A and B are shown apart, each in its own frame.
With several copies, the nearest count.
Chain A
Amino acid sequence: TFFSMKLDIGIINENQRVSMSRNIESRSTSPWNYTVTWDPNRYPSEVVQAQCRNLGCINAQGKEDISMNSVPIQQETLVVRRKHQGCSVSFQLEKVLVTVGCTCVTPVI
């Protein structure tokens, strides 16, 4: 409906980056830790999956508050997979669910 076909050289806005050096993973009330997967046949090579460190959220005192829940936040992302070697190399889009971090939600009945 939209589309092999010619793929143009260079990536538009490749230079854009997410600021990940502000320690939000730790300072969040729903803090999370990271697991990373490297794959040289995937662009980008890194994929970074977050997982909530608590069932509850941390309050100002630093105590776990279970009146609320830490819930992960997933994003549908596209990455390119490099296929074949030599002079018959091709590229194909791959869907990857990336858990980017956790937020704190008041539960419901």
Chain B
Amino acid sequence: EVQLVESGGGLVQPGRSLRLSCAASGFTFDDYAMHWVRQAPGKGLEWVSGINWSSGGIGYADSVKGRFTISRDNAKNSLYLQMNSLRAEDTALYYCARDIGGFGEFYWNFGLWGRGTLVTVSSASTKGPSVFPLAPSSKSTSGGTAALGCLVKDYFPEPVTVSWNSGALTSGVHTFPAVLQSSGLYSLSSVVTVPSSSLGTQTYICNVNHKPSNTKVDKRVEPKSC
């Protein structure tokens, strides 16, 4: 209902090739120019490539020319970015962006964006996460409130999505940015602060997903005595 969903992201080795996809839905797709705009981790925005309705108007940023190839399919309301000779410098979150121009022309201003698809360019290989409970105890309660969480350790590449009770618990949830360990593997924690009197009644489960290794974990965090 008016949204952009990208895909094809994950680990790729320097030199090898990848193709991002973007399913447009809930608007006349051939009425709009379409863009790829990327964002390196903890960096600003960079326009990559654009394509008008006809596919007669193709553009590329200097950083990317000769290596990447934008294309679209008005029939399947879909847009693709063939990336080749990928380097480390190309590691980024790639957003499918929709131009605000009428008649499928370039205004070079973006009104609709997707959720993004992460692309890591690394020789190092996919490891899936270990998920451990951060059990609530006297050392994580005060009086009325009690903290608990899940440790998501020794995975590559980023990211790992965490939810609680399959998305039914969003309040007081603090999932931290991932840290690169000395081993060249990422590790993060998700914590949720909850009433102390509810540790016996309500059962709390963290739902950890790592697409690049195809692991989904449904770990119950039971209270332990420390």
Q: Are B56 and A107 in contact (CB under 8 A)?
A: no
Asked if A23 CB lies within 8 Å of chain B CBs, one says yes
Q: Are A55 and B59 in contact (CB under 8 A)?
A: yes
Q: Give Cα A66–Cα B107 distance, bound, in whole angstroms.
A: 8
Q: Per DSSP, are chain B's interface residues mostly helix, strand or loop, or mixed?
A: loop
Q: Are B103 and A108 in contact (CB under 8 A)?
A: yes
- Among B47-77, those with CB < 8 Å from A are 50, 52, 54, 56-57, 59
Stretch binding the partner chain, chosen from A8-16, A67-75, A82-90: A67-75
Residues of the A chain whose Cβ atoms lie less than 8 Å from the Cβ of B106: 55, 66, 69, 107
Residues of the B chain whose Cβ atoms lie less than 8 Å from the Cβ of A108: 101-103, 105
- Among B169-199, those with CB < 8 Å from A are none
* B50, B52, B100, B106, most chain A CB atoms within 10 A: B106
- Among A37-55, those with CB < 8 Å from B are 51-52, 55
B208 to chain A, nearest CB (A): 42
A70 to chain B, nearest CB (A): 7
Q: Are A23 and B108 in contact (CB under 8 A)?
A: no
Q: Are B107 and A107 in contact (CB under 8 A)?
A: yes
Residues of the B chain whose Cβ atoms lie less than 8 Å from the Cβ of A78: none
Q: Give Cα A36–Cα B57 distance, bound, in whole angstroms.
A: 20
Q: Are A23 and B59 in contact (CB under 8 A)?
A: no
Residues of the A chain whose Cβ atoms lie less than 8 Å from the Cβ of B104: 22
A50 to chain B, nearest CB (A): 10
Enumerate the 6 nearest inter-chain pairs by beta-carbon distance, A residue then B residue, closest first: A22-B103, A108-B102, A69-B105, A107-B105, A107-B101, A55-B59
